Amino acid sequence: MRHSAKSWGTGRAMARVPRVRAGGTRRAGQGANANFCRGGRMFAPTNVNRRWNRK
Amino acid sequence: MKINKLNNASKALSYPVKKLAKTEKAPLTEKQQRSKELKKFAMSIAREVGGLAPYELRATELLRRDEDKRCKKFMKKRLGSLKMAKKKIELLAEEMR
Amino acid sequence: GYLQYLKEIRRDKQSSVMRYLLRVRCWEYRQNTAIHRASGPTYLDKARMLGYRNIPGMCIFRARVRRGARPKKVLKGNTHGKPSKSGVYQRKPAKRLQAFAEIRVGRKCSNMRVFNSYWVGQDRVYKYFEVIMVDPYCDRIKNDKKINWLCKPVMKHREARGLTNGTKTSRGLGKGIRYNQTKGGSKRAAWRNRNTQSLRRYR
Amino acid sequence: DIQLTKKQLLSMNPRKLTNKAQMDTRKEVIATRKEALVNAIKLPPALNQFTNYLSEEDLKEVSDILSKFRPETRKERKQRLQNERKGPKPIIVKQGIKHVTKLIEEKKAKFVLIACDVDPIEVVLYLPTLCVKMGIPYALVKTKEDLGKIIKKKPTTCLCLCDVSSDIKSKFENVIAKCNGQFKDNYESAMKVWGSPKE
RNA sequence: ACCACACGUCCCCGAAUACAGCAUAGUGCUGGAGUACUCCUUGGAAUUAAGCAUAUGAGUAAAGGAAGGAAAAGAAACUAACGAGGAUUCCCGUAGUAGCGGCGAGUGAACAGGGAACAGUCCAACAGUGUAAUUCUCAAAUGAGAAGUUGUCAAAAGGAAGAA
RNA sequence: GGUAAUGCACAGUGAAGAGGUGGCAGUGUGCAUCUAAGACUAAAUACAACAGGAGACCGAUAGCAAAGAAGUAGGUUGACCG
RNA sequence: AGGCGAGCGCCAUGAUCAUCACGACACACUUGUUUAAGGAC
Ligand SMILES: [K+]
Ligand SMILES: [K+]
Ligand SMILES: [K+]
Ligand SMILES: [K+]
Ligand SMILES: [K+]
Ligand SMILES: [K+]
Ligand SMILES: [K+]
Ligand SMILES: [K+]
Ligand SMILES: [K+]
Ligand SMILES: [K+]
Ligand SMILES: [K+]
Ligand SMILES: [K+]
Ligand SMILES: [K+]
Numbered sequence: 001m002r003h004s005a006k007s008w009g010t011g012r013a014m015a016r017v018p019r020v021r022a023g024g025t026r027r028a029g030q031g032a033n034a035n036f037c038r039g040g041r042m043f044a045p046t047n048v049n050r051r052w053n054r055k
Numbered sequence: 056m057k058i059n060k061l062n063n064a065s066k067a068l069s070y071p072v073k074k075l076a077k078t079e080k081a082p083l084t085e086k087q088q089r090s091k092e093l094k095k096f097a098m099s100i101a102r103e104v105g106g107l108a109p110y111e112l113r114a115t116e117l118l119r120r121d122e123d124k125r126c127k128k129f130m131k132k133r134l135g136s137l138k139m140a141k142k143k144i145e146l147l148a149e150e151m152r
Numbered sequence: 153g154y155l156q157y158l159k160e161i162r163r164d165k166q167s168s169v170m171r172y173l174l175r176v177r178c179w180e181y182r183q184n185t186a187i188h189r190a191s192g193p194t195y196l197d198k199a200r201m202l203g204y205r206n207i208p209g210m211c212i213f214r215a216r217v218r219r220g221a222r223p224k225k226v227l228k229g230n231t232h233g234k235p236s237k238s239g240v241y242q243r244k245p246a247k248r249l250q251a252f253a254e255i256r257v258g259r260k261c262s263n264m265r266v267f268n269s270y271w272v273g274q275d276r277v278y279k280y281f282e283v284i285m286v287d288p289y290c291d292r293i294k295n296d297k298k299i300n301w302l303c304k305p306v307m308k309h310r311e312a313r314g315l316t317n318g319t320k321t322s323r324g325l326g327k328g329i330r331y332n333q334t335k336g337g338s339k340r341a342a343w344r345n346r347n348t349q350s351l352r353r354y355r
Numbered sequence: 356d357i358q359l360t361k362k363q364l365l366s367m368n369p370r371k372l373t374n375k376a377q378m379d380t381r382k383e384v385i386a387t388r389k390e391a392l393v394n395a396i397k398l399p400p401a402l403n404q405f406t407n408y409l410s411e412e413d414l415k416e417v418s419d420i421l422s423k424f425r426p427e428t429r430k431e432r433k434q435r436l437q438n439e440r441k442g443p444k445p446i447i448v449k450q451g452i453k454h455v456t457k458l459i460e461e462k463k464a465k466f467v468l469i470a471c472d473v474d475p476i477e478v479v480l481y482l483p484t485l486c487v488k489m490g491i492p493y494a495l496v497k498t499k500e501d502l503g504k505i506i507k508k509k510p511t512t513c514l515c516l517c518d519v520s521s522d523i524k525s526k527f528e529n530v531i532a533k534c535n536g537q538f539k540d541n542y543e544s545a546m547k548v549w550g551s552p553k554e
Numbered sequence: 555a556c557c558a559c560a561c562g563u564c565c566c567c568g569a570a571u572a573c574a575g576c577a578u579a580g581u582g583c584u585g586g587a588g589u590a591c592u593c594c595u596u597g598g599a600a601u602u603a604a605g606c607a608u609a610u611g612a613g614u615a616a617a618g619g620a621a622g623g624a625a626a627a628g629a630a631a632c633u634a635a636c637g638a639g640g641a642u643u644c645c646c647g648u649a650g651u652a653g654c655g656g657c658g659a660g661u662g663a664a665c666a667g668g669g670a671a672c673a674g675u676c677c678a679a680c681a682g683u684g685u686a687a688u689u690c691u692c693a694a695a696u697g698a699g700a701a702g703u704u705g706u707c708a709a710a711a712g713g714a715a716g717a718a
Numbered sequence: 719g720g721u722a723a724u725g726c727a728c729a730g731u732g733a734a735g736a737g738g739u740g741g742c743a744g745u746g747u748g749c750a751u752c753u754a755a756g757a758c759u760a761a762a763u764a765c766a767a768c769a770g771g772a773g774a775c776c777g778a779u780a781g782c783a784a785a786g787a788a789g790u791a792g793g794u795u796g797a798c799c800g
Numbered sequence: 801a802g803g804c805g806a807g808c809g810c811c812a813u814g815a816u817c818a819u820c821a822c823g824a825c826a827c828a829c830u831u832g833u834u835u836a837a838g839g840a841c
């Protein structure tokens with residue numbers, strides 16, 4: 001979730017996934033935050049609050 | 056629900072203890088007496104040097120006309136407490152006499 | 153003794169002698185610059201309750217503060233939000249006016265520690281206060297046995313963290329059911345203790 | 356550089372002197388304008404007392420008695436302690452507000468001097484009423500420096516004497532009678548008259 | 555040869571200062587950086603109510619000030635009505651309770667009872683008057699001077715253990 | 719949470735030496751418990767940078783953005799972006 | 801403490817505290833008329 005990203009909205013002939021704001025690099029316009037994206041965030045991130053022990 | 060089963064009469068009962076009497080502290084030593092005297096003395100000098108404040112003058116004037124209930128209302132509004140008012144009236148009365 | 157007589161006179165603020173002196177002194181305080189050094193304490197008894205002695209490395213400064221409530225810092229009264237948060241005037245500060253005096257003296261006298269403060273007068277426009285200061289880098293003070301504690305590094309800038317007699321009173325500290333909002337150390341310490349989820353090993 | 360005249364200093368507005376260079380002048384404007392204000396307004400009876408003080412002639416008479424009971428210097432004190440105790444208890448004049456008030460309260464004090472030019476005044480304000488209540492005679496002196504000179508040391512607020520050597524007794528009694536005239540005998544009348552603006 | 559421990563040397567800009575404010579008999583001190591955690595101010599809206607204006611999110615985000623290895627708090631102008639207890643902080647609990655609320659949505663503490671760790675003290679009021687006995691400087695082997703009577707001055711070395 | 723005011727402020731007003739409190743407004747009267755408006759305090763509690771030890775964790779489109787000269791190559795007039 | 805109409809209200813004037821205009825001084829406050837001008841507005 002590190003990057004500055006925003007959706008381009010409809011009318012550009014592209015899918016409405018958030019995209020990376022940049023210039024000068026091949027990284028411009030790539031697909032950012034979602035679980036179906038390269039370098040994006042996983043579904044339901046694993047978390048320390050899980051119950052480890054049992055009675 | 057484990058609440059509200061006894062009546063008020065039975066809740067008021069108590070176990071029969073043997074009590075100890077309180078140790079009274081009535082004796083006041085020589086040095087304590089002089090200490091209190093000097094404080095009361097100092098309070099005289101201030102009143103002598105600087106006199107009464109404006110509302111104290113207005114209050115004492117009403118006492119001469121026997122406007123007792125007017126003075127009561129006036130003092131209540133100045134000091135806030137009906138107890139402080141009753142005390143200050145008694146001190147002012149004694150000063151005039 | 154002498155200090156008792158001074159106490160009784162200082163308490164009679166509507167005696168003829170005290171009305172005279174308050175009038176002449178409040179005239180002088182306003183002709184001077186907003187923070188200035190004093191020659192000594194105006195009230196000897198009061199300064200001595202609060203810990204002043206006439207030794208090298210202690211000083212009195214005097215400060216004035218403007219009176220009344222403090223308005224919300226917005227242009228043309230426009231708050232960009234809900235109507236219950238649209239009021240500008242009749243908003244009263246959290247700290248006493250005394251606290252502002254202490255904070256400003258501490259900025260000006262940056263090489264010294266703020267000990268305590270007291271009231272000395274009022275008029276239509278200003279309210280006036282004396283602040284007691286100490287110098288921790290002074291040989292006389294470093295070897296004292298009553299105020300040598302002010303040299304501990306934790307004692308830097310007491311006034312900025314609400315630790316002085318004038319700055320403490322807005323915190324809401326006390327003992328008993330009337331002060332439940334500060335059980336723990338402060339309002340924020342109480343908030344944390346009440347808004348936390350505890351997750352034990354076996355549960 | 357140049358000394359300003361009284362007229363100039365009374366004309367200037369102190370709040371418009373602002374530069375670091377100007378601070379000494381700001382001090383002088385305040386000092387002169389304060390004087391004009393105090394002369395213009397009425398004094399309460401208790402403060403009005405400290406306007407009445409001994410003549411330089413009477414001050415001489417009193418000092419010429421009292422000077423014979425001067426306190427010990429540190430040089431003298433050292434010598435005394437290398438030697439043994441000898442002779443009767445000395446008579447000495449005493450100093451400082453804390454001790455003086457104690458001696459008045461204990462009814463030990465026999466005569467007292469007080470200075471007028473003291474700031475803040477609340478330090479000495481109560482002394483005459485206490486002296487009248489205990490029945491001790493007193494007198495007022497113009498400056499703190501007048502007192503310092505009697506005992507050959509730094510200025511003070513008040514001096515006190517608790518004993519009389521027989522050698523001095525005749526002169527002492529006369530001095531007390533002069534003082535009672537100007538001061539203690541007049542007290543009950545004084546506490547009712549307000550100080551007029553000055554001409 | 556090479557390595558490890560310490561020291562010496564350490565260009566220009568930068569708080570950047572041949573400066574600003576401030577204290578003492580004098581020497582001086584502050585300023586900038588860092589701010590996860592602690593203390594003090596200032597103070598939203600998206601959102602929920604299937605609309606929305608009180609309310610909620612929240613005294614949260616954002617912006618300012620300040621300190622330490624922790625910080626804050628702390629020895630009752632305290633609870634309780636028992637046959638009573640006894641500083642502060644932390645854990646289990648009273649309790650999603652007593653109550654607050656377009657009594658709607660939603661909010662919401664305290665004493666007890668069981669434990670961890672435990673410690674109490676200072677200033678003012680109130681300092682030898684047969685002598686300020688008090689702090690500092692230079693000299694000297696016993697003198698000069700500064701602060702102070704608007705009040706100075708209320709006592710011990712010392713140790714083997716423990717840990718990394 | 720504090721409900722005919724739980725705490726904090728501002729303006730008017732302003733005490734007594736004896737006062738404060740006992741979760742519902744007022745007046746009176748016994749009873750119980752404390753002493754405000756000055757200060758200091760250890761231990762038990764919280765958590766970055768940096769160092770050390772572990773793991774039913776991930777295995778080069780994963781795991782920190784970054785397993786190589788990574789906040790680098792490169793980019794914005796700029797704040798900033800990568 | 802006076803006076804009127806078949807002790808009542810009404811008409812006379814004499815003591816007790818605030819108090820609204822008007823004057824005349826200078827002390828707060830105001831203005832580069834400043835060794836000065838205003839003025840409790
Ligand atoms: K984001
Ligand atoms: K009084
Ligand atoms: K000094
Ligand atoms: K606020
Ligand atoms: K909760
Ligand atoms: K800083
Ligand atoms: K809604
Ligand atoms: K909706
Ligand atoms: K928020
Ligand atoms: K602490
Ligand atoms: K503390
Ligand atoms: K407790
Ligand atoms: K316990």
Ligand SMILES: [K+]
Nearest residue numbers: 628629756757
């Ligand atoms: K305390």
Ligand SMILES: [K+]
Nearest residue numbers: 038039783784
């Ligand atoms: K990557």
Ligand SMILES: [K+]
Nearest residue numbers: 790791792793
């Ligand atoms: K670059």
Ligand SMILES: [K+]
Nearest residue numbers: 825826838839
């Ligand atoms: K005139």
Ligand SMILES: [K+]
Nearest residue numbers: 365366826837
């Ligand atoms: K004039």
Ligand SMILES: [K+]
Nearest residue numbers: 833836837838
């Ligand atoms: K004229």
Ligand SMILES: [Mg+2]
Nearest residue numbers: 039040041042
């Ligand atoms: Mg990833």
Ligand SMILES: [Mg+2]
Nearest residue numbers: 059060061062
């Ligand atoms: Mg029942």
Ligand SMILES: [Mg+2]
Nearest residue numbers: 067068069070
């Ligand atoms: Mg019982």
Ligand SMILES: [Mg+2]
Nearest residue numbers: 248321322755
């Ligand atoms: Mg308060």
Ligand SMILES: [Mg+2]
Nearest residue numbers: 600601605606
């Ligand atoms: Mg809407």
Ligand SMILES: [Mg+2]
Nearest residue numbers: 236609610612
């Ligand atoms: Mg709200």
Ligand SMILES: [Mg+2]
Nearest residue numbers: 612613661662
């Ligand atoms: Mg809330």
Ligand SMILES: [Mg+2]
Nearest residue numbers: 614615616617
């Ligand atoms: Mg923030």
Ligand SMILES: [Mg+2]
Nearest residue numbers: 677678679680
């Ligand atoms: Mg003491």
Ligand SMILES: [Mg+2]
Nearest residue numbers: 720721723741
């Ligand atoms: Mg209540």
